[PDB]
Amino acid sequence: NLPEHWTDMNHQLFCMVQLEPGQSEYNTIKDKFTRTCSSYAIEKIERIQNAFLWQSYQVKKRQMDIKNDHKNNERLLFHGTDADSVPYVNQHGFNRSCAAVSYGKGTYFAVDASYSAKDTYSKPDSNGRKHMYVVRVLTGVFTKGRAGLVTPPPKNPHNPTDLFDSVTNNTRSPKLFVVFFDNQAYPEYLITFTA
Amino acid sequence: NLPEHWTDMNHQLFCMVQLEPGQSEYNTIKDKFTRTCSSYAIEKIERIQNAFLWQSYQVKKRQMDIKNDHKNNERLLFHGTDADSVPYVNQHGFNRSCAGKNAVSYGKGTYFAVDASYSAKDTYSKPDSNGRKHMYVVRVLTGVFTKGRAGLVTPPPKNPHNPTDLFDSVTNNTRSPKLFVVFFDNQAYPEYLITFTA
Ligand SMILES: CC(C)(C)c1ccc(-c2nc3c(NC(=O)[C@H](O)CO)cccc3c(=O)[nH]2)cc1
C-alpha cells in the first residue's frame, strides 16, 4: 500500500517528514522548484505521508488507468496557497469548494513553480514565508477549459457522461490544469520558501 | 471487492438491474418507501451496480470505520432528483457542485432525507414529461454529525482549536435527524433508483 520511500510512522496514518538537505529526494524536489524559481530561498521541504489520501488517490489512479486504457494519466504539478490553508491540505487534500476560476470551478495546478509562486497564490504570511505543494495530479485526457464549468466537458456530446479527466488553458502547451473531483490530486511535498 | 450478489457484468463497469417484486431485496425498499409515501405507486426499482463508485465509496467507509470508534457510520437515505440528472448520478454519483439550495439550508452540500416523503416532493423528484418521479436510495457515510448551518462548505470542526478534525456530516437536528448533508465526493453510494408515479 504505502510507498517505499516513506519512512516509518509508528503505526500512525499521517506524518509530515522534513527532508534532509543534500540527499537524493530533497535534491530531486528542489531541482523541480529551482528550474523556474531559482531566485527564491528554500527554508525546508517536507514529505506529506497521508495514508488515507494516498489510498483514495491510488484507487482513482487505478480506475483512470483502466478507463483510458493507458497509464500516462499522472503529472507532477505545483499548487501555491496561503498559510491558513496548509493544515487542511495536508490532512484533507484539495477541495474545489474552498476556491479565480476562469477555466472552471475546480482546483488549479501549475506546470511551472514560478506560476504558483505568485503572491496571489502562495500568499506570504506574517513572516514572509510562502508555501507551495508539489502534487501528483491525475490529469488524464484533457481539453480546454472555460469559465463556469463544474465538471470537465464530455468527450462526445453523444455520451454526455463520458468526461474528460481535467481541463487546461491550452491543450498544445498547457501551463495550468484544473481537476474537479476530490482525490484526483495527492499533495506529496510542501515547500516553504521566501522571495 | 464487488458484492457477490451482483449480476455478472461481463467485464463492464456499470449496469442497472431491474428487481422483481416478491424478492426480499425489492420488498424491503418498497416497504421503506411506502412507510411515508403510501399515496404514490412504484413503477420499478433498479439496483445500481457501479464498480468504480462502489470501490471509492467502500474505501471511504473503511477509513471512517477506522477513524471513528466502533460507530455505525452508514445510513440508508433517500435522494429525489430530476430526470436530467439521473444519467450523471448513475455514473458519477452525487456532486455537491451541482446541488440545489435546500429550502432549509444546513450547508452547501448534497442533501439526503431520512423519509422518502421528503424526497418525494416535486421540488426534488421533479416529474418528467411522462409524469415519472425519480428517487435514489443511498448508502451515506453520515459518521459523527452535528447540527449544520447555512454557511458551511465543509463539515465544521469538532473542536474550534483543531480546525482540521471534522465532523463527518451535518444534520437539521441531532436529536431527531430528518436530513443529512455531505460535503465530499464518494461519501454516498447511489444503490437503488426508484421510478414512481402518482
Ligand atoms: C484561495 C486562495 C488562497 C486565494 C488561492 C487562490 C489561488 C490559488 C492558485 N491558483 C492557481 C491558478 N489559478 C488561475 O489560473 C486562476 O485563478 C483561474 O482563473 C493557476 C495555476 C496554479 C495556481 C495555484 O497554484 N494556486 C491558490 C490559493
Short mmCIF file of C-alpha atoms and ligand atoms in Angstrom, two decimals:
data_model
loop_
_atom_site.label_atom_id
_atom_site.label_comp_id
_atom_site.label_asym_id
_atom_site.label_seq_id
_atom_site.Cartn_x
_atom_site.Cartn_y
_atom_site.Cartn_z
CA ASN A 1 0.00 0.00 0.00
CA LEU A 2 2.18 2.84 1.32
CA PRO A 3 5.18 3.88 -0.80
CA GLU A 4 8.63 2.50 -0.06
CA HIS A 5 10.37 5.89 0.17
CA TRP A 6 8.08 6.89 3.03
CA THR A 7 9.55 6.44 6.49
CA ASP A 8 8.03 4.62 9.43
CA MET A 9 5.08 6.27 11.17
CA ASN A 10 4.85 4.18 14.36
CA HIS A 11 1.52 2.75 13.18
CA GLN A 12 0.06 6.24 12.62
CA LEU A 13 -1.70 7.37 9.45
CA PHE A 14 -0.46 10.96 8.95
CA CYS A 15 3.00 12.47 9.27
CA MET A 16 4.86 15.44 7.78
CA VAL A 17 8.52 14.42 7.36
CA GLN A 18 11.11 17.14 6.86
CA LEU A 19 13.58 16.11 4.19
CA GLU A 20 17.33 16.05 4.79
CA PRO A 21 19.05 18.64 2.56
CA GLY A 22 21.62 17.21 0.16
CA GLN A 23 20.08 13.74 -0.07
CA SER A 24 18.65 12.45 -3.32
CA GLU A 25 14.95 13.01 -2.58
CA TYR A 26 15.44 16.58 -1.36
CA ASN A 27 17.67 17.36 -4.35
CA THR A 28 15.11 15.97 -6.81
CA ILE A 29 12.25 18.08 -5.45
CA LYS A 30 14.43 21.16 -5.04
CA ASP A 31 15.54 20.87 -8.68
CA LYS A 32 11.94 20.81 -9.93
CA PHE A 33 11.27 24.03 -7.99
CA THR A 34 14.52 25.83 -8.85
CA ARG A 35 14.07 25.13 -12.58
CA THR A 36 11.87 28.24 -12.60
CA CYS A 37 12.19 29.61 -9.04
CA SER A 38 15.96 29.82 -8.56
CA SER A 39 15.79 33.36 -7.16
CA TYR A 40 13.79 32.19 -4.13
CA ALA A 41 15.16 30.77 -0.87
CA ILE A 42 14.05 27.32 0.29
CA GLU A 43 13.66 27.05 4.07
CA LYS A 44 12.57 23.42 4.14
CA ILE A 45 10.88 20.68 2.14
CA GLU A 46 8.52 18.22 3.82
CA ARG A 47 7.24 14.88 2.58
CA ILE A 48 3.49 14.51 3.13
CA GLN A 49 2.64 10.99 4.36
CA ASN A 50 -1.16 10.89 4.47
CA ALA A 51 -2.26 7.26 4.20
CA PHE A 52 -5.97 7.94 3.63
CA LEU A 53 -5.40 10.49 0.89
CA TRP A 54 -2.84 8.24 -0.78
CA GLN A 55 -5.20 5.27 -0.73
CA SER A 56 -8.13 7.21 -2.24
CA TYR A 57 -5.82 8.76 -4.86
CA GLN A 58 -4.30 5.40 -5.86
CA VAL A 59 -7.77 3.92 -6.27
CA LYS A 60 -8.69 6.76 -8.60
CA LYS A 61 -5.41 6.30 -10.48
CA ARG A 62 -6.09 2.58 -10.98
CA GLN A 63 -9.57 3.41 -12.24
CA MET A 64 -8.30 6.07 -14.64
CA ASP A 65 -5.62 3.71 -15.98
CA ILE A 66 -8.43 1.22 -16.76
CA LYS A 67 -10.82 3.81 -18.21
CA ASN A 68 -8.24 5.40 -20.51
CA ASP A 69 -6.66 2.03 -21.49
CA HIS A 70 -3.25 3.62 -20.83
CA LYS A 71 -1.08 4.57 -17.86
CA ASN A 72 0.12 8.07 -18.74
CA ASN A 73 -2.52 9.81 -16.61
CA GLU A 74 -0.32 11.37 -13.90
CA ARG A 75 1.65 14.62 -13.86
CA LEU A 76 3.69 16.35 -11.15
CA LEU A 77 2.37 19.88 -10.75
CA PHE A 78 2.56 22.77 -8.28
CA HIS A 79 -0.02 24.45 -6.07
CA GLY A 80 0.68 27.65 -4.14
CA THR A 81 -1.67 28.55 -1.31
CA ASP A 82 -1.86 30.63 1.83
CA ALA A 83 -0.59 29.51 5.22
CA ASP A 84 -4.14 29.27 6.58
CA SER A 85 -4.97 26.51 4.07
CA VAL A 86 -1.85 24.37 4.66
CA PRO A 87 -3.13 22.28 7.63
CA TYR A 88 -6.31 21.45 5.71
CA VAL A 89 -4.47 20.40 2.55
CA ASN A 90 -2.02 18.23 4.48
CA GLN A 91 -4.93 16.38 6.10
CA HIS A 92 -7.71 16.58 3.52
CA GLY A 93 -6.13 17.40 0.17
CA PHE A 94 -7.51 19.80 -2.40
CA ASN A 95 -11.16 20.83 -2.15
CA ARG A 96 -12.77 22.75 -5.00
CA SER A 97 -15.33 24.19 -2.58
CA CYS A 98 -12.59 26.30 -0.94
CA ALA A 99 -11.78 28.17 -4.17
CA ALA A 100 -10.04 32.67 -9.62
CA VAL A 101 -11.89 30.04 -11.67
CA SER A 102 -11.53 31.26 -15.25
CA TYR A 103 -11.20 27.70 -16.60
CA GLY A 104 -13.75 26.06 -14.30
CA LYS A 105 -14.74 25.65 -10.64
CA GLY A 106 -12.07 23.19 -9.58
CA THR A 107 -8.59 23.14 -8.04
CA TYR A 108 -5.82 24.71 -10.12
CA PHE A 109 -2.30 23.31 -10.54
CA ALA A 110 0.65 24.89 -12.34
CA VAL A 111 3.15 23.28 -14.67
CA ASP A 112 5.81 25.79 -13.55
CA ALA A 113 6.60 26.52 -9.92
CA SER A 114 7.05 30.18 -10.86
CA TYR A 115 3.31 30.45 -11.59
CA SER A 116 2.36 29.04 -8.19
CA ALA A 117 4.99 31.34 -6.66
CA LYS A 118 2.87 34.44 -7.39
CA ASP A 119 1.87 36.25 -4.21
CA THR A 120 -1.82 35.94 -5.18
CA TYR A 121 -1.46 32.13 -4.79
CA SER A 122 1.38 31.39 -2.33
CA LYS A 123 0.44 34.39 -0.21
CA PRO A 124 3.31 35.47 2.06
CA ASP A 125 2.40 35.01 5.71
CA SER A 126 3.05 37.43 8.57
CA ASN A 127 6.72 36.30 8.48
CA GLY A 128 7.17 36.47 4.69
CA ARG A 129 7.06 32.69 4.32
CA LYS A 130 5.43 31.26 1.18
CA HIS A 131 4.03 27.75 0.77
CA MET A 132 3.84 25.60 -2.36
CA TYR A 133 2.90 21.97 -2.77
CA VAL A 134 4.34 19.51 -5.25
CA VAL A 135 1.31 17.45 -6.28
CA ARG A 136 0.60 14.20 -8.06
CA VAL A 137 -2.34 15.06 -10.35
CA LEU A 138 -4.43 12.68 -12.45
CA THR A 139 -4.72 14.96 -15.44
CA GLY A 140 -5.56 12.04 -17.72
CA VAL A 141 -7.15 13.07 -21.00
CA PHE A 142 -7.73 16.81 -21.02
CA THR A 143 -9.37 19.53 -23.10
CA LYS A 144 -9.54 23.31 -22.98
CA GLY A 145 -11.49 24.72 -20.05
CA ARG A 146 -13.82 27.70 -19.80
CA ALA A 147 -15.49 29.79 -17.13
CA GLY A 148 -18.35 28.20 -15.21
CA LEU A 149 -17.53 24.51 -15.69
CA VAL A 150 -18.41 22.39 -12.67
CA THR A 151 -17.03 19.14 -14.22
CA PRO A 152 -14.86 18.59 -17.30
CA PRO A 153 -16.75 18.64 -20.61
CA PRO A 154 -17.89 15.39 -22.21
CA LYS A 155 -15.56 13.79 -24.71
CA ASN A 156 -18.53 13.47 -27.08
CA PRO A 157 -21.94 15.20 -26.83
CA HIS A 158 -23.44 11.82 -27.84
CA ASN A 159 -22.34 10.33 -24.47
CA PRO A 160 -22.63 13.31 -22.10
CA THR A 161 -21.47 11.24 -19.09
CA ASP A 162 -18.10 10.07 -20.51
CA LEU A 163 -15.97 13.01 -19.40
CA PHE A 164 -12.51 14.37 -19.92
CA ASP A 165 -10.40 13.94 -16.78
CA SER A 166 -9.24 17.56 -16.44
CA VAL A 167 -9.13 20.84 -18.34
CA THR A 168 -6.30 23.21 -19.19
CA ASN A 169 -5.70 26.70 -20.55
CA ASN A 170 -4.04 25.41 -23.73
CA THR A 171 -4.06 21.78 -24.90
CA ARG A 172 -0.99 22.11 -27.13
CA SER A 173 1.22 23.74 -24.47
CA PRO A 174 -0.51 23.56 -21.09
CA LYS A 175 0.58 25.72 -18.20
CA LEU A 176 -2.26 25.01 -15.75
CA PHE A 177 -4.61 22.10 -15.09
CA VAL A 178 -7.95 22.10 -13.30
CA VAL A 179 -9.40 18.99 -11.64
CA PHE A 180 -12.97 18.83 -10.41
CA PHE A 181 -13.07 15.86 -8.03
CA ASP A 182 -11.65 15.02 -4.66
CA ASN A 183 -8.73 12.59 -4.61
CA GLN A 184 -7.66 13.39 -8.16
CA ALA A 185 -4.60 15.09 -6.60
CA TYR A 186 -2.22 13.92 -3.87
CA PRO A 187 -0.14 16.59 -2.09
CA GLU A 188 3.29 14.92 -1.99
CA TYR A 189 5.71 17.63 -0.83
CA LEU A 190 5.33 21.02 0.86
CA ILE A 191 7.97 23.63 0.06
CA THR A 192 8.36 26.54 2.48
CA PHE A 193 10.29 29.39 0.85
CA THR A 194 10.81 33.15 0.68
CA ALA A 195 11.35 35.67 -2.08
CA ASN B 1 -14.37 -6.28 -3.92
CA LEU B 2 -17.68 -6.25 -5.79
CA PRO B 3 -20.61 -7.78 -3.85
CA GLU B 4 -21.20 -11.42 -4.73
CA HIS B 5 -24.96 -10.98 -5.15
CA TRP B 6 -24.49 -8.50 -8.01
CA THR B 7 -25.15 -9.75 -11.53
CA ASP B 8 -22.12 -10.64 -13.62
CA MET B 9 -21.31 -7.59 -15.71
CA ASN B 10 -19.17 -9.30 -18.38
CA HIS B 11 -16.14 -7.14 -17.54
CA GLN B 12 -18.29 -4.00 -17.87
CA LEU B 13 -18.04 -1.28 -15.23
CA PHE B 14 -21.69 -0.24 -14.83
CA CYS B 15 -25.21 -1.57 -15.23
CA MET B 16 -28.70 -1.14 -13.82
CA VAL B 17 -30.51 -4.30 -12.70
CA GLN B 18 -34.30 -4.35 -12.58
CA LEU B 19 -35.56 -6.00 -9.42
CA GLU B 20 -38.52 -8.42 -9.15
CA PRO B 21 -41.43 -7.78 -6.77
CA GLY B 22 -41.67 -10.54 -4.20
CA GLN B 23 -37.92 -10.79 -3.75
CA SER B 24 -36.83 -9.57 -0.34
CA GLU B 25 -34.47 -7.00 -1.90
CA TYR B 26 -37.34 -5.32 -3.79
CA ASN B 27 -39.86 -5.62 -0.97
CA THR B 28 -37.63 -4.07 1.69
CA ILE B 29 -37.03 -0.98 -0.45
CA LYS B 30 -40.72 -0.80 -1.32
CA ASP B 31 -41.59 -1.01 2.40
CA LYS B 32 -39.03 1.67 3.29
CA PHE B 33 -40.51 3.93 0.62
CA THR B 34 -44.19 3.27 1.32
CA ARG B 35 -43.68 3.87 5.04
CA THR B 36 -44.03 7.58 4.26
CA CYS B 37 -45.04 7.59 0.56
CA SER B 38 -48.16 5.42 0.59
CA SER B 39 -50.01 7.73 -1.83
CA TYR B 40 -47.51 7.12 -4.67
CA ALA B 41 -47.01 3.94 -6.68
CA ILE B 42 -43.70 2.39 -7.69
CA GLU B 43 -43.12 1.68 -11.36
CA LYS B 44 -39.80 -0.12 -10.91
CA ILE B 45 -36.75 -0.40 -8.64
CA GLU B 46 -33.29 -0.80 -10.15
CA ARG B 47 -30.13 -1.92 -8.40
CA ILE B 48 -27.24 0.35 -9.37
CA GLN B 49 -24.05 -1.64 -9.99
CA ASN B 50 -21.30 0.97 -10.49
CA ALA B 51 -17.94 -0.66 -9.89
CA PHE B 52 -15.77 2.44 -9.62
CA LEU B 53 -18.21 4.37 -7.40
CA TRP B 54 -18.54 1.33 -5.15
CA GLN B 55 -14.76 0.95 -4.80
CA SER B 56 -14.16 4.62 -3.91
CA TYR B 57 -17.13 4.65 -1.52
CA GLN B 58 -16.00 1.47 0.20
CA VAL B 59 -12.51 2.95 0.64
CA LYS B 60 -14.05 5.98 2.37
CA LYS B 61 -16.20 3.73 4.55
CA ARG B 62 -13.22 1.67 5.66
CA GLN B 63 -11.34 4.86 6.52
CA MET B 64 -14.24 6.28 8.51
CA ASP B 65 -14.73 2.95 10.30
CA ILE B 66 -11.02 3.07 11.25
CA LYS B 67 -11.10 6.71 12.31
CA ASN B 68 -14.30 6.56 14.34
CA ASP B 69 -14.82 4.47 17.48
CA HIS B 70 -16.99 1.45 16.61
CA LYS B 71 -19.62 3.81 15.22
CA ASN B 72 -22.39 2.85 12.81
CA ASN B 73 -21.14 5.27 10.17
CA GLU B 74 -23.55 4.38 7.36
CA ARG B 75 -27.24 5.13 6.96
CA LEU B 76 -29.64 4.28 4.12
CA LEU B 77 -31.20 7.56 2.99
CA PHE B 78 -33.25 8.94 0.09
CA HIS B 79 -32.44 11.49 -2.60
CA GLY B 80 -35.01 12.85 -5.04
CA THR B 81 -33.80 14.36 -8.28
CA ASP B 82 -34.86 15.33 -11.78
CA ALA B 83 -34.69 13.09 -14.81
CA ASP B 84 -31.97 15.18 -16.44
CA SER B 85 -29.64 14.32 -13.53
CA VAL B 86 -30.21 10.54 -13.40
CA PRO B 87 -27.62 9.53 -16.06
CA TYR B 88 -24.88 11.58 -14.31
CA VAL B 89 -25.76 10.30 -10.83
CA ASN B 90 -25.85 6.69 -12.05
CA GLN B 91 -22.35 7.03 -13.50
CA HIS B 92 -20.67 9.58 -11.27
CA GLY B 93 -22.63 9.85 -8.05
CA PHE B 94 -23.58 12.97 -6.16
CA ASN B 95 -21.68 16.17 -6.93
CA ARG B 96 -22.04 18.94 -4.35
CA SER B 97 -21.14 21.47 -7.03
CA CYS B 98 -24.46 20.67 -8.75
CA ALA B 99 -26.64 20.56 -5.64
CA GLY B 100 -29.58 22.90 -5.33
CA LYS B 101 -30.06 25.20 -2.38
CA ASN B 102 -32.37 23.44 0.06
CA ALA B 103 -35.44 25.31 1.28
CA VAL B 104 -33.95 24.93 4.76
CA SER B 105 -30.19 25.04 4.28
CA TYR B 106 -27.84 23.42 6.78
CA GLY B 107 -24.86 23.79 4.47
CA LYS B 108 -23.74 23.89 0.85
CA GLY B 109 -23.57 20.21 0.10
CA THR B 110 -25.54 17.21 -1.12
CA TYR B 111 -28.76 16.55 0.84
CA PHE B 112 -30.19 13.15 1.82
CA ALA B 113 -33.53 12.51 3.52
CA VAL B 114 -34.47 10.03 6.24
CA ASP B 115 -38.07 9.92 4.98
CA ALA B 116 -38.96 9.13 1.39
CA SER B 117 -41.86 11.59 1.71
CA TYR B 118 -39.36 14.44 1.82
CA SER B 119 -37.54 13.37 -1.33
CA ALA B 120 -40.93 12.70 -2.95
CA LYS B 121 -41.70 16.43 -3.07
CA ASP B 122 -41.91 17.75 -6.62
CA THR B 123 -39.16 20.24 -5.77
CA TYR B 124 -36.69 17.34 -5.56
CA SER B 125 -38.12 14.40 -7.57
CA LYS B 126 -39.37 16.62 -10.36
CA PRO B 127 -41.92 14.78 -12.53
CA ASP B 128 -40.61 14.26 -16.04
CA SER B 129 -42.64 14.80 -19.22
CA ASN B 130 -44.26 11.38 -18.68
CA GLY B 131 -45.13 12.02 -15.07
CA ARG B 132 -42.35 9.81 -13.68
CA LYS B 133 -40.60 10.82 -10.47
CA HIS B 134 -37.16 9.50 -9.53
CA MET B 135 -35.66 8.85 -6.09
CA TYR B 136 -32.37 7.22 -5.19
CA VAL B 137 -31.86 5.03 -2.15
CA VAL B 138 -28.35 5.83 -0.98
CA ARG B 139 -25.71 4.47 1.39
CA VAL B 140 -24.43 7.63 3.10
CA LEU B 141 -21.42 7.86 5.41
CA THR B 142 -23.09 10.12 7.99
CA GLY B 143 -20.44 9.16 10.56
CA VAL B 144 -20.35 11.53 13.53
CA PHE B 145 -22.57 14.53 12.86
CA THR B 146 -23.75 17.81 14.35
CA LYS B 147 -26.38 20.42 13.54
CA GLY B 148 -25.34 22.19 10.36
CA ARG B 149 -25.53 25.86 9.35
CA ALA B 150 -26.19 27.53 6.01
CA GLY B 151 -22.71 28.96 5.64
CA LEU B 152 -20.88 25.60 5.65
CA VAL B 153 -18.88 24.45 2.62
CA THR B 154 -17.33 21.56 4.62
CA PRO B 155 -18.44 19.96 7.88
CA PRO B 156 -17.49 22.03 10.92
CA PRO B 157 -14.64 21.03 13.21
CA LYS B 158 -15.46 19.09 16.34
CA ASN B 159 -13.15 21.39 18.28
CA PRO B 160 -12.61 25.05 17.31
CA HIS B 161 -8.95 24.84 18.32
CA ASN B 162 -8.29 21.91 15.95
CA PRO B 163 -9.95 23.18 12.77
CA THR B 164 -8.97 20.21 10.57
CA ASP B 165 -10.55 17.43 12.70
CA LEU B 166 -14.04 17.48 11.18
CA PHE B 167 -17.44 16.06 11.77
CA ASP B 168 -18.31 13.61 9.01
CA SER B 169 -21.67 15.19 8.10
CA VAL B 170 -24.29 17.60 9.40
CA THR B 171 -27.99 17.34 10.08
CA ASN B 172 -31.01 19.51 10.74
CA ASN B 173 -31.49 18.22 14.29
CA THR B 174 -29.20 15.83 16.18
CA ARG B 175 -31.99 14.59 18.47
CA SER B 176 -34.38 13.83 15.57
CA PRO B 177 -32.38 13.84 12.33
CA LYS B 178 -34.50 14.09 9.19
CA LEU B 179 -31.87 15.20 6.66
CA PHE B 180 -28.11 14.87 6.31
CA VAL B 181 -25.66 16.95 4.31
CA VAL B 182 -22.34 15.62 2.99
CA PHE B 183 -19.55 17.73 1.52
CA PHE B 184 -17.13 15.28 -0.10
CA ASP B 185 -17.09 13.03 -3.13
CA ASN B 186 -17.56 9.29 -2.68
CA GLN B 187 -19.28 9.73 0.70
CA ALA B 188 -22.59 8.48 -0.74
CA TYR B 189 -23.22 5.46 -3.00
CA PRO B 190 -26.42 5.52 -5.12
CA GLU B 191 -27.61 1.96 -4.55
CA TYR B 192 -31.19 1.85 -5.92
CA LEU B 193 -33.21 4.02 -8.27
CA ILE B 194 -36.96 4.11 -7.60
CA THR B 195 -39.13 5.25 -10.51
CA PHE B 196 -42.63 6.12 -9.32
CA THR B 197 -45.80 7.96 -10.25
CA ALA B 198 -48.86 9.46 -8.58
C1 LIG C 1 -7.85 30.61 -2.07
C2 LIG C 1 -6.55 31.35 -2.34
C3 LIG C 1 -5.60 31.22 -1.14
C4 LIG C 1 -6.85 32.84 -2.58
C5 LIG C 1 -5.84 30.74 -3.60
C6 LIG C 1 -6.07 31.28 -4.87
C7 LIG C 1 -5.44 30.74 -5.99
C8 LIG C 1 -4.58 29.64 -5.84
C9 LIG C 1 -3.85 29.03 -7.06
N1 LIG C 1 -4.27 29.31 -8.33
C10 LIG C 1 -3.62 28.79 -9.38
C11 LIG C 1 -4.07 29.06 -10.66
N2 LIG C 1 -5.25 29.90 -10.77
C12 LIG C 1 -5.65 30.59 -12.00
O1 LIG C 1 -5.04 30.48 -13.00
C13 LIG C 1 -6.87 31.48 -11.95
O2 LIG C 1 -7.16 31.69 -10.59
C14 LIG C 1 -8.06 30.87 -12.68
O3 LIG C 1 -8.93 31.92 -13.09
C15 LIG C 1 -3.40 28.56 -11.75
C16 LIG C 1 -2.28 27.77 -11.55
C17 LIG C 1 -1.83 27.50 -10.28
C18 LIG C 1 -2.48 28.03 -9.17
C19 LIG C 1 -2.05 27.80 -7.90
O4 LIG C 1 -1.05 27.19 -7.67
N3 LIG C 1 -2.75 28.27 -6.86
C20 LIG C 1 -4.35 29.09 -4.56
C21 LIG C 1 -4.98 29.65 -3.45
#
